[PDB]
């Protein structure tokens with residue numbers, strides 16, 4: 264149900280050049296997880312009923328923010344600002360979603376389709392829309408399903424975004440990587456989740472909730488057994504997330 | 513542009529009986545200003561663009577709240593709770609707006625028309641929608657005009673709600689009554705505003721802003737000279753406020 268806007272050839276050229284620059288920058292700076300989180304969090308403020316929030320450039324340097332546990336988003340936007348300045352024609356909204364797409368790609372993840380044309384709108388979303396790491400399956404459905412409009416499949420696949428990166432005690436309070444290879448986009452998140460707690464590795468209560476739900480659990484099993492299937496569902500879910508409220512939502 | 517819902521005869525009977533009970537209670541308890549503020553603040557959270565917030569029972573005992581400077585709303589709902597319990601058929605939304613209407617009437621104000629049928633909806637509005645007493649004319653238009661959808665005339669007339677009551681240093685931080693007769697609904701708010709500061713009396717920066725605006729100021733002058741005209745415009749504005757998002761907004 265999407266109808267993507269037309270952008271100029273010059274806009275399209277800037278998207279391609281920015282995509283390359285983002286690859287090199289993100290790879291060199293080792294900041295893929297931070298960038299994926301920035302993109303996903305920006306997009307995740309969308310509420311379908313009111314059609315407010317979503318990936319529309321509302322988070323930017325200097326952030327903003329406020330918003331806690333969390334923290335780190337401020338660093339991400341500052342890191343990207345010099346690069347963004349090289350592409351004044353691009354909206355911040357597009358730039359940050361493209362960074363998220365690139366973050367998945369340069370860590371070896373699937374190639375998430377990207378369509379340009381998001382407009383930067385004046386007011387940021389209200390707070391309290393982000394998921395709470397201490398809560399469970401009902402809460403996940405409230406946030407990703409009732410508010411964002413994503414499916415149960417999307418919830419499990421997107422949770423696999425935790426396959427890269429780590430929590431920090433000075434940010435959320437949780438601490439450490441979900442995986443033994445936290446710069447490699449793979450299905451290890453699901454394998455580690457299944458095998459229970461392991462020293463050095465993190466599981467949020469929100470991750471564990473996937474294990475006890477009769478719909479989520481079989482997907483966790485599927486993804487743990489089949490990385491190709493995880494990649495396919497992940498790319499579909501990330502694309503939908505990145506396009507919430509855009510070109511029809 | 514209103515189409516009021518049908519309510520049962522029993523509902524209508526409860527409205528009439530509650531209205532009488534509210535008169536006696538509010539008069540005896542000397543809480544008209546607190547009740548007017550409760551009604552007006554509840555209604556004032558409405559945002560026309562998203563059709564969220566408004567007078568829909570979202571503030572209630574035990575409050576809730578949070579929301580500061582402010583404070584006092586908690587007292588108001590607790591005060592009304594035993595009376596509300598005598599009218600289980602009425603929505604809290606209707607009950608609180610009726611209390612606001614009665615508050616104006618028992619202090620000698622105009623008779624604001626009341627239509628029943630507001631439904632109590634699950635989620636409270638987001639915060640930050642209430643007006644800031646330290647700000648000026650542009651801010652008032654942002655809040656009452658852009659968000660609520662009220663006119664410049666409505667803004668000045670409704671500001672006259674300050675003709676009853678007082679600020680408290682432990683609540684907002686401001687202190688004292690706007691008028692020498694703070695339980696009498698009259699046009700004294702405008703007279704005191706015009707005459708400048710007087711010992712014992714309060715003026716918020718938001719009140720003073722009415723004086724410097726080329727649209728607001730002539731209305732302040734008009735209301736100060738003609739209480740009948742103030743009453744007419746006030747009743748119109750209070751009715752609109754009390755019905756935001758209801759029966760079409």
Ligand code: HEM
Nearest residue numbers: 296299300303394395396421424428429430431434435469
């Ligand atoms: C399902 C609900 C989710 C919850 C409760 C949640 C919560 C969290 C928390 C608490 C952190 C730690 C932040 C810190 O301390 O630095 C974090 C980090 C992260 N999140 Fe999630 N998140 C969720 C969904 C997602 C989604 C859908 C994605 C992307 C598809 C994502 C991507 C990431 C990444 C990559 C990190 C690592 C950040 C870094 O390494 O600095 N998360 N998340």
Ligand code: HEM
Nearest residue numbers: 545548549552643644645670673677678679680683684718
């Ligand atoms: C125009 C923007 C407005 C601002 C900035 C504002 C601000 C305030 C503040 C700071 C207080 C003092 C609270 C305390 O310390 O106890 C107050 C009280 C009050 N407000 Fe307003 N208000 C506004 C509009 C209105 C409207 C539209 C109404 C009703 C029609 C209203 C009715 C009242 C009443 C009756 C009180 C006295 C409360 C008491 O005596 O406890 N106000 N307001």
Ligand SMILES: [K+]
Nearest residue numbers: 426442444447
């Ligand atoms: K990994």
Ligand SMILES: [K+]
Nearest residue numbers: 675691693696
């Ligand atoms: K008065």
